Design a protein around this ligand. Structure first.
Ligand SMILES: Nc1nc2c(ncn2[C@@H]2O[C@H](COP(=O)(O)OP(=O)(O)OP(=O)(O)O)[C@@H](O)[C@H]2O)c(=O)[nH]1
Ligand SMILES: Nc1nc2c(ncn2[C@@H]2O[C@H](COP(=O)(O)OP(=O)(O)OP(=O)(O)O)[C@@H](O)[C@H]2O)c(=O)[nH]1
Ligand SMILES: Nc1nc2c(ncn2[C@@H]2O[C@H](COP(=O)(O)OP(=O)(O)O)[C@@H](O)[C@H]2O)c(=O)[nH]1
Lengths: 62, 426, 60, 52, 170, 430, 411
C-alpha cells in the first residue's frame, strides 16, 4: 500500500513538469507579444506626431 | 454486495442460529437440501449477503458454529436445515468450560479461538465489502460468555472499522439457571463496554411473558423462543436484502441511535405478535402496529422503559405502507407521552420502511429503543456480584485459574461508572 | 504521512493548473488586442497618405 | 526584569537563568531593529541638507 | 514570536551556505545520495537499507533524482514554517544538525536555542525530545539527535481523535 | 439551450424517476428510448445514432440498492449505463462520512462524467441539482460537488432544488448537524436555491389532492410538475418567455439571499375538475395563499422582495397583467418598500400533461409561482434552536470528529449561519 | 498491392487465428492483397499448429504453409536462436521467397511475435535478420508483445526481452508495442469483460491490424499506404516504437446509447486509459501522431478534432514538430465477427503515435533484468545453449544508449 501511494505522488510531480514547462513557453510568447505592443504603439504615435506637423505647416503656409 | 458473517457461540448461540438459518432460507426460497426454488427475481438478487453459491445451485450459509461440547453440534446436523452448513465451519473443542468464565476466557479459550479465527478470517476474505459481524451468545454461561467475549475482543483488534452486533440474552434473578450468573454477567459486560460496537440486551423473563400473554402458548419449548428471536434478527437486516422507500443499513442505525460511545445497549420489541384466537379479529394498519410496538409488556427485555426516559428509538417497518403514516405515528406517540422522551434531543425516533414483509404476514415491524431504564439490570446484577465477592465465595476456580483480585475490582468500578454515567445522561 | 503528502502535492498541482488556464486567457485576449490595434495603425497610416497627398496638391 | 530576579547571578547552583538570558536576547535584538527603524524614520523629510 | 525567527534566519543564512558546500564532496551544487552516507559517517551514525532513498525522495518535488540548492532552500523554508503542516522532515534534521554544529561532535545546550526558536515550550517539553537536564551537560552525537527527532514526529503523528475525544461533562 | 440535471442520494434519484417518466411521456418517447424539426426534446435528450434519445442526467449515490432498481426497471434502455453512478457503502446519515470519508473518492468520477455531458452540450444554460440536506449523501458530497462545480465553471447557473428537514415531520435524528454543515456551503456555492419542505407537500396532498395516505411517489410527481413548468420556456415557444438566467438577476437582491418559496396551482383532483372552471383570475389568487406552498412557513410574517410567475396553457397577457395589478393593490400581502414592482410574469403555450396513474387532473392552464421573502429567516432561527439544543452537550459529535472533523467547523459554521440571520433581518429593516 | 503476413510462436499464430478469421469474413479484386492465404504459421512445438490443421480452416490454408518443428524452444532465446532455430528458419524463408515470387507489387512483410518466449524472441529475430539481407528495402511491420511490469507468466522474460529488442532496433522498420496487462485493463474497463482470456485480446488486435491495412484493400477519401507510416512517424532511424490505440472499444449495450462522432473518438484515442501499452504518455512529449479513420467521416471534423487536441494542455507536443499529425480516411466501415464482443460502429479510429513514454518502459525493464544478471542467475541455461557471458552485458549497454537517446531528443 505504501508503494501504491508512492507511485500516485510521483505521478502528480511528473504531471507538474509539463505544466510548468508550458507555462514558461507561454511567458516567453506573451513577452514577445507585449514587447511588440510597445513597439507598434510608438510607431503609431510617430505617425500621429508627424500628422500634426504636416497640418500645421500647410495651414501656416496659406 | 455488503456481507455479514454469522458467529454462534455455546449452546444458546447454536440453537438460536439454527432456527435463524431456517427462517432466513424460507424467506429466500432455499429448500433444506440447499438448492434454489424461488420464483421472484427479488429473492435471487440479494443472497450474497448471507450465502455463497457453491456448485450447481448449492447455496451454503455464511455461518460459523463454535462451542465446547459435541452435543450441540450433533443436535444441529440432526435437525432439518442441518445439512446446509459447510462441515469445515464447525470449529469445535472437546473438554468444556463448566460455566467457569475463566475456563472460557483463559484456560480453554487459548486453544480454540485461534482455530475459530481462521474460519472467521476465511469468511471475511471470502466476501468483498464487509458490512459487519453478527454474534449470538449468552451472558450467564461459560462457553458462550467467555469464548464469545475473547473472540469479540480479538476481532475488533483485527477489523476495527467494521460494524458488529452481539445478540445476547442476560440472566435475571427470577430465571436463575446457573449459580455463578453474576460473576459471568459483570465480567462479560465489562468486556462488551469497550469492544462491541452495539449490543442488544435480551433476557429470558421477557421471552416467557411474551409466550404467556401475547402468544398465549401452552407448552413454549425453546423452539418458540428461538423462533421469536430469529424474527427480530431478520428484521434488523431486511434493509440490506430488499429495496424500499426508506432504507436503513446497520451503520445508519448505529450512528443515528448511539449518542455517546459507551451507551450502546438496546431494548428490542417486535410486531405483530398475535395469538391464533385473535389473528383473525385484528386489522393491519400502521397505528395498530405502533401501539403494539411501543407497548411496555411487548419489550423483549425485562426492563420497563416507563421507569425511565427514552434517549433514542428506532423503527424498522416491512411491507407496502405509506410513509406519511410512518412519520405521523412517530410524531403522535412522542407528543402525548412527552415526559417519557429525553428533552435535549428533538425527534428522538428514527424510522425506516422496507417493501418486503415476512412470509405469511401482510405487514410487520421491529423496534429498537435505546432507553435509560437499562441501568436497573446493571444494578440488579451488580449488587448480587458485590454480595458474593465480599466473602470470596466461588472464587478459587476464578483466582486459581488466572484471575486476581483487581480484575473483580475493575469489573465493579467499570460497572459503577457506567450506571453513574447512565444516571447523568438521563 | 504519505496520505497527507499526496494531498499537499495535489493542491500544488491544481494551483499550477488554474494558473495555466489563466495564462491561456492572457495569451488569447492579447492576440485580439494586436488585431484591433494594428487596424488603428492602418487608419492613422491611411490618414497620412491622404494627408501628404493634399499638401503637394496645394503646393503646386 | 532581569535585574529583579531572585537567584544570585554568579552562582551556577540555579542554572535556570539560562532561559531568562535567552529571553533577554530577543528583545535586545528587538530594541536594535526598533532603533534601526528610528534612524530610517526621522529622515523622511528634512528641511536642510546641513541641519540633517 | 516572529522576531526570534526573523533574527535567526538573518544569521543562519551565511552558516547554511557553507553547510551546503561542506555536505557536498564533489565540489558541485548537487547533493547525491552518496554524499549523505559520508555525512552520516562524519556524524557517526549509520543509515538503514532504504533510508537514503526515502531521504532523497521526500525532499525533492520539482524534479526527480539528485537534489539542488534551490530545492534545499525551498525545503528549509517550508519545514521551518511547517509547524502545523504534518509534513516530512527527514533531511531537514541532518542539515539543521550540521548548521547547529560548531564543535564537530554535536551540540549540548544549543538544543534550547533550537527549542526556543521553534517555541518557548516548557522544561518538561525539553524532557520529551531528550533527557538533558538544566545543570548537567552531556556528550552528544549525530546518533542521538536524529533518532529522537524522528521518533517524536512519529509519536505526534499517531495520536488522533476517534473515541479518544472528551466532551465537557453534563 | 441545453441543461443537465443531476440527482444526489436516495431522495434525489427518486425525484428523478418521476421527472424522466413525465418528460418522455410529454415528447411521445417510448420507455425503450425510440420515437415510434420537433427539437423541443433536445434540451434534455441528445439524439444518438438514428432514432434514439438519451437523457442529459446522471444519478449518483453511495448506496447500491436505490440506483439498482432503476437499472432493472422499465427504463433499462433509456439511460446509458455509465450515467447511473453507485458506491460501495453508504454515508449513513453522517455528513462527515459523506464529505470526508466516502465522498472524497466518488466525486472525482462524478465530475469526469459531468465533464463530457457539458462537452456534448453547446449553449449550456446551467445545471440543476436534486438533493435533500437532511441525509448524508445529499448533504456531504452534495456540498462537495457544488464546491468543485464552482471552481470548474463558476459563471454558469447552478439551480439547486433542496429539501430541508421539516420541523416536526422527520425521519432522522442528526439531521440538524447535516443541515447546518451543508448550508454553510449552500450559501456561497449555489447561485439559485429553492427550498422544499416535506410537511408542506404532505399537507397539500391531504387537503387538495384528497389522498389521505400519500407515499413518496405522489410527492415526486408534483415536484416534476414544478420543474417541468420552469423548463417549458426552454422547450416550447410562448407569448412571453423567461429563461434560467432571469432568476439570477430578478430574484436575488443580495449575493447571500437566494432562497425561494415555490408553489403550484391548480392542484385539483379529477372529479372537481369537472365542477370548477380554472381561469386565470382565480389561479393567480391561488398562487399566493399559504395553503398551496411548497415550504411549511408563513410569508405573512415577512415582506416580499420579488416574485416570478410561470403561466402555462391558453393565457393571454391581458388578463394576467390585470390580475397582477389586483394582487398588488390588495393589502393582505405586502411588499418591501424599496422595490416598487415585485413581479416578473411569464406565459407559455403548452398546457401541463397528465401521466397515467398520476393524481393530477387534466387542466386548461396552470401557474407555478417562485417568490422570495423573509419568512425564510424564521426557518433558520427555528433550526438554530434545536441544533444548539443538542450541541450544548456535544451530543453525536463523536461520530463526526472520529470521521475527520474537529471543533472549529461546528463553532465557525454555527456562527456563520448566525451572521446569515443578521443579513435577512437587516435587509427587512427600513 | 499485396502484403504477406508471417506468424511466429504460440502467441503469433494464435493472433493469426483471429486475423485470418476476420479477413476471410470481411471479403466474404479487393481481396487480391490477401488472397489460399498469403501466410506462413511457424512454430517449434507442433501442438498449436495441429490445432490449425484439425480446425475448421483445414481447407483454407495450403498444407505446406503451416510450418511446425519437432521440439520446443524451452523459453530460451539461446535455444530458439542457435540450437533449434537453425533447422526451421531455412525452411521458413525458402517458402517466403516463392510466396513473394507469386506476388508482383509487394508492399512489405508484417510479423507477429511475443518477445517473452523462446521462439517469438529467438527465431523471430533470426528470421528478421535474414529477411533484411534478402530484401532490405521492403517494409517489415513488427507487432511485438513486450512483457508487462506487474503481470507476468514467466520468470526469465527480462532476459529474452532485452536480448530480442537489441536486434529489433536495426531489423524492423516499424515496431508497435502491445502489452498484455494494458489490454486486460482495457477489456475490463470499456468492454466490461471481468474474466477475459487470450481469445478476446487476439480478437481486438486483429481489429487494429485490419484498420491500418484497409487503405490498401478499399478506396478511401484520403488513402494512406504502408510507406506513409515509414516516413511520417519515424523522425530518426533509431526511434521506431509506437503506441497504439483504437476507438471505440465499446460493448453492445453502451454503444447504441452513445453518440459516436469524430471529435469524441479522437479525444478517446488520446487518453492513457485506452492505449494498448501500459505507459503514461503524459509523462512524455509527443513527436508525431497518425490517425486512421474508417467509415462515415468527412475531412472537416477530423481536422476540427485535431485542432482541439493541439490547443489542449493536458498533453504537450515536441518543439521540433509543430505539424505533428498524419490523418487518413477510408470509406469501408469496420466489420464484426459473430461471437466477437464488439458491436457494429459507423466509424472507428486507430491511432499510432510516437512519444517518450516508451523511453520510460525500457528503463523499467532494465532494472529487473539488471538485478538478476549481476549475480548470474539463470545465465547458465543460455550459455549451455550456445551463448556466452559477453552478449548479456553488451545488450545491456545497447538499451542504455537507447535511454540516453530518448532523454536527449525530448529536450
Ligand atoms: N420528497 C421526497 N423526499 C424523500 C424521498 N425519499 C427520501 N426523502 C427524504 O430524504 C431524507 C433522508 O435522506 P435520504 O434521501 O432518504 O437518504 P440520503 O440523502 O441518500 O442519505 P443516506 O441515507 O446516508 O444515503 C428524509 O428526510 C426524506 O424526507 C422522496 O421520495 N421524496
Ligand atoms: N496477446 C496474446 N499473447 C499471448 C498469447 N499466448 C501467449 N501470449 C504471450 O506470450 C508470452 C509468452 O511467450 P510465448 O508466446 O508463450 O512463447 P512462444 O512463442 O510459445 O515460444 P515457446 O513457448 O518457447 O515455444 C507472454 O507475454 C504471453 O502473455 C495469446 O494468445 N495472445
Ligand atoms: N432462548 C434460549 N435460551 C437458552 C436455550 N438454552 C439455554 N438457554 C439460556 O442459556 C442460559 C444458560 O446458558 P448456557 O446454555 O449454559 O450457555 P453456554 O454453556 O455458554 O452455551 C440460560 O439462562 C438459558 O436461559 C435455548 O434453547 N433457547
Amino acid at each position: 500500500h505504501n508503494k501504491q501511494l508512492r507511485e500516485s505522488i510521483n505521478n502528480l510531480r511528473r504531471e507538474r513538469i509539463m505544466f510548468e514547462s508550458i507555462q514558461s513557453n507561454l511567458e516567453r510568447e506573451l513577452a514577445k507579444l507585449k514587447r511588440d505592443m510597445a513597439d507598434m504603439i510608438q510607431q503609431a504615435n510617430g505617425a500621429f506626431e508627424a500628422r500634426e506637423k504636416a497640418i500645421g505647416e500647410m495651414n501656416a503656409l496659406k | 454486495m455488503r456481507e455479514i458473517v454469522h458467529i454462534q457461540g455455546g449452546q444458546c448461540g447454536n440453537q438460536i442460529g439454527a432456527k435463524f438459518w431456517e427462517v432466513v432460507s424460507d424467506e429466500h426460497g432455499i429448500d433444506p437440501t440447499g438448492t434454489y426454488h424461488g420464483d421472484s427475481d427479488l429473492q435471487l438478487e440479494r443472497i450474497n449477503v448471507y450465502f455463497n453459491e457453491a456448485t450447481g445451485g448449492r447455496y451454503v450459509p455464511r455461518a460459523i458454529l463454535m462451542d465446547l461440547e459435541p452435543g450441540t453440534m450433533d443436535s444441529v446436523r440432526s435437525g432439518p436445515y442441518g445439512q446446509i452448513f459447510r462441515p469445515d465451519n464447525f470449529v469445535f473443542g472437546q473438554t468444556g468450560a463448566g460455566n467457569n468464565w475463566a475456563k472460557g476466557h483463559y484456560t480453554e479459550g487459548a486453544e480454540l479461538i485461534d482455530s475459530v479465527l481462521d474460519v472467521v478470517r476465511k469468511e471475511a476474505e471470502s466476501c468483498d465489502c464487509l458490512q459487519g459481524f453478527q454474534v449470538c451468545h449468552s451472558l450467564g454461561g461459560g462457553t458462550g460468555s467467555g469464548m464469545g467475549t475473547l473472540l469479540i475482543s480479538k476481532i475488533r483488534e483485527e477489523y476495527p472499522d467494521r460494524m458488529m452486533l452481539t445478540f445476547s440474552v442476560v440472566p435475571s434473578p427470577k430465571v436463575s439457571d446457573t449459580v455463578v450468573e453474576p460473576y459471568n454477567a459483570t465480567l462479560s459486560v465489562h468486556q462488551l463496554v469497550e469492544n462491541a460496537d452495539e449490543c442488544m440486551v435480551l433476557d429470558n423473563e421477557a421471552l416467557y411473558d411474551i409466550c404467556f400473554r401475547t402468544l398465549k402458548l401452552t407448552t413454549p419449548t425453546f423452539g418458540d423462543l428461538n423462533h421469536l428471536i430469529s424474527a427480530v434478527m431478520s428484521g434488523i437486516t431486511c434493509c440490506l436484502r430488499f429495496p424500499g422507500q426508506l432504507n436503513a443499513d446497520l451503520r445508519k442505525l448505529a450512528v443515528n441511535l448511539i449518542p455517546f460511545p459507551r451507551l450502546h445497549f438496546f431494548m428490542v420489541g417486535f410486531t405483530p405478535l398475535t395469538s391464533r384466537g385473535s389473528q383473525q379479529y385484528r386489522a393491519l394498519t400502521v397505528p395498530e402496529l405502533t401501539q403494539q410496538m411501543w407497548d411496555a409488556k411487548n419489550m423483549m427485555c425485562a426492563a420497563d422503559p416507563r421507569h425511565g426516559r427514552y434517549l433514542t428509538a428506532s423503527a424498522l417497518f416491512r411491507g407496502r405502507m405509506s410513509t406519511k403514516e410512518v412519520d405521523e405515528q412517530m410524531l403522535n406517540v412522542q407528543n402525548k407521552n412527552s415526559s417519557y422522551f429525553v428533552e435535549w434531543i428533538p425527534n428522538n425516533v428514527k424510522s425506516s420502511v422496507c417493501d418486503i414483509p415476512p412470509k405469511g404476514l401482510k405487514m410487520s415491524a421491529t423496534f429498537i429503543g435505546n432507553s435509560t431504564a437499562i441501568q436497573e439490570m446493571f444494578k440488579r446484577v451488580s449488587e448480587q456480584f458485590t454480595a458474593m465477592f465480599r466473602r470470596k465465595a466461588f472464587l478459587h476456580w476464578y483466582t486459581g485459574e488466572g484471575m486476581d483480585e483487581m480484575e473483580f475490582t475493575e469489573a465493579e468500578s467499570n460497572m459503577n461508572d457506567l450506571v453513574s454515567e447512565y444516571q447523568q445522561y438521563q | 504521512l504519505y496520505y497527507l503528502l499526496g494531498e499537499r502535492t495535489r493542491r500544488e498541482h491544481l494551483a499550477m493548473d488554474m494558473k495555466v488556464r489563466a495564462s491561456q486567457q492572457l495569451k488569447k485576449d492579447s492576440a485580439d488586442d494586436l488585431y484591433t490595434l494594428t487596424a488603428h495603425f492602418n487608419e492613422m497610416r491611411a490618414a497620412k497618405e491622404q494627408a501628404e497627398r493634399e499638401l503637394a496638391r496645394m503646393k503646386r | 526584569d532581569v535585574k529583579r530576579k531572585p537567584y544570585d547571578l554568579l552562582d551556577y547552583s540555579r542554572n535556570a537563568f539560562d532561559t531568562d538570558f535567552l529571553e533577554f536576547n530577543v528583545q535586545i535584538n528587538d530594541l536594535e531593529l526598533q532603533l534601526q527603524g528610528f534612524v530610517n524614520a526621522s529622515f523622511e523629510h528634512i528641511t536642510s541638507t546641513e541641519h540633517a | 514570536a516572529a522576531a526570534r525567527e526573523r533574527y535567526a534566519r538573518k544569521n543562519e543564512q551565511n552558516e547554511l551556505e557553507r553547510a551546503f558546500n561542506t555536505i557536498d564532496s564533489k565540489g558541485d551544487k548537487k547533493i547525491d545520495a552518496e554524499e549523505l552516507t559520508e555525512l552520516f559517517l562524519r556524524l557517526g551514525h549509520k543509515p538503514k537499507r532504504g533510508e537514503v532513498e526515502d531521504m532523497i525522495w521526500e525532499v525533492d518535488e520539482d524534479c526527480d533524482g539528485c537534489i539542488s540548492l534551490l530545492e534545499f532552500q525551498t525545503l528549509y523554508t517550508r519545514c521551518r514554517d511547517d509547524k502545523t503542516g504534518y509534513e516530512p522532515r527527514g533531511l531537514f534534521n541532518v542539515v539543521e544538525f550540521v548548521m547547529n554544529d560548531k564543535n564537530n561532535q554535536g551540540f549540548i545546550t544549543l538544543e534550547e536555542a533550537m527549542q526556543i526558536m521553534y517555541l518557548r515550550y516548557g522544561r518538561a517539553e525539553l524532557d520529551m525530545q531528550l533527557e538533558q537536564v538544566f545543570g548537567t551537560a552531556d556528550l552528544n552525537s549525530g546518533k542521538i539527535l536524529t533518532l529522537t527527532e524522528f521518533l517524536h514526529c512519529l509519536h505526534t503523528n499517531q495520536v488522533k481523535q476517534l473515541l479518544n475525544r472528551v466532551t465537557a461533562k453534563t | 439551450r441545453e441543461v443537465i440535471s443531476i440527482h444526489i442520494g436516495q431522495a434525489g434519484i427518486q425525484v428523478g424517476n418521476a421527472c424522466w417518466e413525465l418528460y418522455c411521456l410529454e415528447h411521445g418517447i417510448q420507455p425503450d428510448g425510440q420515437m415510434p424539426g420537433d427539437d423541443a426534446f433536445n434540451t434534455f435528450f441528445s439524439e444518438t445514432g438514428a432514432g434514439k434519445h438519451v437523457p442529459r442526467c446522471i444519478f449518483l449515490d453511495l448506496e447500491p440498492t436505490v440506483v439498482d432498481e432503476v437499472r432493472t426497471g422499465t427504463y433499462r434502455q433509456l439511460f446509458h449505463p455509465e450515467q447511473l453512478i453507485s458506491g460501495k457503502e453508504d454515508a449513513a446519515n453522517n455528513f462527515a462520512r459523506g464529505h470526508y470519508t466516502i465522498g472524497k473518492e466518488i466525486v472525482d468520477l462524478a465530475l469526469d462524467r459531468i465533464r463530457k455531458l457539458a462537452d456534448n452540450c453547446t449553449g449550456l444554460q446551467g445545471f440543476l441539482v436534486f438533493n435533500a440536506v437532511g441525509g448524508g449523501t445529499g448533504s456531504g458530497l452534495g456540498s462537495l460537488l457544488l464546491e468543485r462545480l464552482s471552481v470548474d465553471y463558476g459563471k454558469k447557473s447552478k439551480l439547486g432544488f433542496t429539501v430541508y428537514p421539516s420541523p416536526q415531520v422527520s425521519t432522522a435524528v442528526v439531521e440538524p448537524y447535516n443541515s447546518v454543515l451543508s448550508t454553510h456551503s449552500l450559501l456561497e456555492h449555489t447561485d439559485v436555491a429553492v427550498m422544499l419542505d416535506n410537511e408542506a407537500i404532505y399537507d397539500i396532498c391531504r387537503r387538495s389532492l384528497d389522498i389521505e395516505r400519500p407515499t413518496y411517489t405522489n410527492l415526486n410527481r408534483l415536484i416534476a410538475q414544478v420543474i417541468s413548468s420552469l423548463t417549458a420556456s426552454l422547450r416550447f415557444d410562448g407569448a412571453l418567455n423567461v429563461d434560467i438566467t432571469e432568476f439570477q438577476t430578478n430574484l436575488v437582491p443580495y449575493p447571500r439571499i437566494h432562497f425561494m418559496l415555490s408553489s403550484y396551482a391548480p392542484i385539483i383532483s379529477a372529479e372537481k375538475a369537472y365542477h370548477e372552471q380554472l381561469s386565470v383570475a382565480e389561479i393567480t389568487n391561488a398562487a399566493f395563499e399559504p395553503a398551496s406552498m411548497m415550504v411549511k412557513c408563513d410569508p405573512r410574517h415577512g415582506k416580499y422582495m420579488a416574485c416570478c410567475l410561470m403561466y402555462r396553457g391558453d393565457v393571454v397577457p391581458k388578463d394576467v397583467n390585470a390580475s397582477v395589478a389586483t394582487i398588488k393593490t390588495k393589502r393582505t400581502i405586502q411588499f418591501v418598500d424599496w422595490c416598487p414592482t415585485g413581479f416578473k410574469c411569464g406565459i407559455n403555450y403548452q398546457p401541463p400533461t397528465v401521466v397515467p396513474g398520476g393524481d393530477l387532473a387534466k387542466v386548461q392552464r396552470a401557474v407555478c409561482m417562485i417568490s422570495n421573502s423573509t419568512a425564510i429567516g424564521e426557518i433558520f432561527s427555528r433550526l438554530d434552536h434545536k441544533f444548539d439544543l443538542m450541541y450544548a452537550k456535544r451530543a453525536f459529535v463523536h461520530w463526526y470528529v472520529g470521521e475527520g472533523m474537529e471543533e472549529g467547523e461546528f463553532s465557525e459554521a454555527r456562527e456563520d449561519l448566525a451572521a446569515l440571520e443578521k443579513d435577512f433581518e437587516e435587509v427587512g429593516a427600513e
